[model samples]
Target: MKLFAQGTSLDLSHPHVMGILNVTPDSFSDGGTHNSLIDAVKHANLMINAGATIIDVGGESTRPGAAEVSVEEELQRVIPVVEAIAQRFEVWISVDTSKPEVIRESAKVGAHIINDIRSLSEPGALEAAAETGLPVCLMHMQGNPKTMQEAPKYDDVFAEVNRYFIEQIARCEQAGIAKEKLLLDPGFGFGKNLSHNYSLLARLAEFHHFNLPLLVGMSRKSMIGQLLNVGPSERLSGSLACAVIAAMQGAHIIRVHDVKETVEAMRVVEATLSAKENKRYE
Candidate 1:
């Protein structure tokens, strides 16, 4: 399958790695590392060379308990970086914001995808994304970032999440965003507790019922650290494990921090799956 937008398109027949580039001060992992426009450009080049097919640039920190940034601030933070990446690279640039202005302006600069944590539920966000004509990744977050994880409750997490997506798909279609231009993310760490996160991961393949591309981001997230009792810096092994699981279950895009390492790990997964396919005819 392929996702086309503006002048770029992503081939989803294979698992693609989306390098995470946060131009914020307080993101849970790698925060403040690429706050400068030059630093962000340097990191974007590094990830592109490390086998990242997409570079996900976020101006605001959506890590739980993270304070929101003003729309003007967010646009200032991301537009230049987006423009630089588009000018310097041939890779897909994904803007990770839920604000209407951010979505509209980033697309003007050259973002191929809109990876909204809010699933475009923010007022005006849906209209903004649809107007861009870029593929939109609609994630399932239980609540606003500030209070999402405080007390996330669901009777049958998978079913409830699925129901949410069903509603969202309809909403987007109504808003004039083609179903083909929509991707799904279960929001692994957005508002889910430990058990909820794991359950969703284990049953991720069930989301194929909609047959839309699935994007999963569990890189060094709290879900890993909380389980292993380690900090973000020490969750590489856990993160790789999650990546393999997501790949095995058919995740189209894997958003991550350690791009080089994750790309190497995904190579093994692709190799194994390739071998299996070859054996089918033997």
Candidate 2:
């Protein structure tokens, strides 16, 4: 599969790494690490060099209990970073945002994807994303960030998430966004408790029923740390395992913080799968 984002087209035949670049003071992990222009660009270049196919830039922290930022503040924090990366690199720059202005301006400056956790449910987000003509990663968040984790219950997590995707995709189509220009994210830690996250991961392939590209972000997330009983800093091994599993299950893109390690792991997975397919063809 190929995802066309404005001037770029990302081939999705193998799993692609999307490095996380959060320009916020309070993102769950790696917060305050790249909040400035120089730091953000430096980090983006580092990830690209390390084999990140996409650099996902976020201005706000969507971690549970994360405080929201004003639209003006978000614009200030993210736009310059997007412009800097666009000018400096040739990789896909995914703007992680839900605000209409951020969506509009990031695309103007050169953002290839709109990776929104809110799934374009934010008022005007759908219209803004459509106007930009960028591929939108529609993620499944059970509720708003602040209170999503307070109580996230589902009868059947897989069924519910798929239902959510169906509705969201219809909404995108209604708003004039082509279904072919879309990706789905199960939203691992957004509102899910431990079991919900794992259940979704185990059944991640069922999402292929939509046949659209699947983008998953479980790097340095609570889903890993919480289950392993380790802190964010100590979850690299767990994160790598998650990346491997996701890729093996047909993930098109794996959004991660540790790009180098995840890229290496995916390489092995790709090689193994490639060899198996080659033998079958022969």
Candidate 3:
């Protein structure tokens, strides 16, 4: 499969790694690490050197019970960093946002993709994103961040998430967005409880029924913390374990915080796949 952007194509025949660049001060994993524009650029270069093809940057914190930031603040935070990165780096840039104004502004400044946790359900969000015609990743969130994990219940999680995508994809098609510019994310951490998150990961490949690229964001989330008996600051080993497993399970892209280590793990995965394919020839 392929994803289109800026008159170029991204080959998705194998799993890809999109390194997380949080420009906010309160994100779970690397909150204050790259909050400045210059620092973010440096981090982006490092991730790119470490084998990140796409840099997924976000200005808002979507951690559980996370409060909403105004559009002005979000644009102020994300746009400058995007402009800087686009000017210097050759890597694909994805804006992690849900607001329509932020979406429009980021696209205007040359962001290649929109990673919306809300699935573009907000008012004007679909129209704004579709109008850009850039690739957009629509993710499924059970509820808003603040209330998603409160009392989450699902009779059949995978099937229900697929239904959610069916509805969202129908809406996007109705909005004049081409099918090539669409991607799907199961929203691993947005609004799901610990159990729901694992269930989704365990059954992630089932989402390939849609035949679109799958983006799974299960980076240093609380789900890993819950299992490892560790806090966010100390979840490196735990997060990498989750990342490699997600890649082996058929995720097209693994959105993560630990870029260098995760890329090394994926290299091991790629090497194993290469060996298997070579054996077929012999």
Model 3, span 1-282: residue lDDT tens? 888777667888777889988776554224333446677789899999999989998877776567777776777778888888988988889999889998988988879999887778888999999888898898887767765447467887877888989998888999998777799998877657788888888887678778888888877788888888887889989888787777776678888788888888988877766667431111
TM-score quality measure for candidate 2: 0.93
| Deviation of model 3 at 21, angstroms | 1.3
* Per-residue alpha-carbon lDDT of candidate 1 for residues 1-282, written as tens digits (9 for 90 to 100): 899877667789789999999876453124323446777889899999999999999978776567778776676678888999999989998899989999999989889999998889889999999888899998888777665447478888999899999999999999999999999999988778899999999998789889899999999988999999998799999999999999887789999999999999988888877777531111
Candidate closest to the true structure, highest lDDT: 1
Shift in Å, residue 133, candidate 3: 0.2
lDDT of each: 0.86, 0.85, 0.81
What would the per-residue lDDT of candidate 2 be over residues 111-153, giving only the tens digit for each residue?
9999988888778989999988889998888777676437467
Checking candidate 2 for backbone clashes, the offending pairs are none
Query: What shift in Å separates residue 75 of candidate 3 from its native position after superposition?
Result: 1.6
Give the runs in model 2 whose Cα sits over 4 Å from its true position.
25-35, 278-282
Best-first order by lDDT: 1, 2, 3
- lDDT of candidate model 1 versus the reference: 0.86
Give the range where candidate 1 is weakest over 10 consecutive residues by summed lDDT.
26-35
- lDDT for 193 in candidate 2 is 85
